[PDB]
């Protein structure tokens, strides 16, 4: 079995929204109290012991 | 009587040893044969090879 | 201390120590993204390139 890669593109999809509404959202999320925060679903240290 | 005349000359000197400091005897800078220095039970490599 | 059944083949034990793994992403300026990674009772010893 073998594989080869001919062309990898990146695709993106952008929500159309009015420019005045868009820039208001941006200005709100460049504050430091409006920082996004995420967590891993399985938050763990993963250890293998023979 | 033909093979009374033959010329013969020594083979090339061809010294074979090891390398300068034992180069290429330990994998370095190879991902897939990376040596690991790790803690007691941390399970974290303290060697990163690029 | 774990006690397990014998098995003829080589085996591993996979122990998961569940933590909080949190990233707090701030973008404060155009074309800039920043992040801080907290991990609690098994903090990141790495911070590799």
UniProtKB/TrEMBL annotation, chain B:
Section of the entire sequence shown: 299 to 348 of 942
Known function: Major capsid protein that self-associates to form 240 hexon trimers, each in the shape of a hexagon, building most of the pseudo T=25 capsid. Assembled into trimeric units with the help of the chaperone shutoff protein. Transported by pre-protein VI to the nucleus where it associates with other structural proteins to form an empty capsid. Might be involved, through its interaction with host dyneins, in the intracellular microtubule-dependent transport of incoming viral capsid to the nucleus.
Subcellular location: Host nucleus; Virion
Remaining remarks: All late proteins expressed from the major late promoter are produced by alternative splicing and alternative polyadenylation of the same gene giving rise to non-overlapping ORFs. A leader sequence is present in the N-terminus of all these mRNAs and is recognized by the viral shutoff protein to provide expression although conventional translation via ribosome scanning from the cap has been shut off in the host cell.
Highest taxon, organism lineage: Viruses
Family, as annotated: Belongs to the adenoviridae hexon protein family.
Induction (free text): Expressed in the late phase of the viral replicative cycle.
Annotated organism of origin: Chimpanzee adenovirus Y25
Record protein name field: Hexon protein
Quaternary assembly: Homotrimer. Interacts with the capsid vertex protein; this interaction binds the peripentonal hexons to the neighboring penton base. Interacts with the hexon-linking protein; this interaction tethers the hexons surrounding the penton to those situated in the central plate of the facet. Interacts with the hexon-interlacing protein; this interaction lashes the hexons together. Interacts with host dyneins DYNC1LI1 and DYNC1I2; this interaction might be involved in intracellular microtubule-dependent transport of incoming viral capsid.
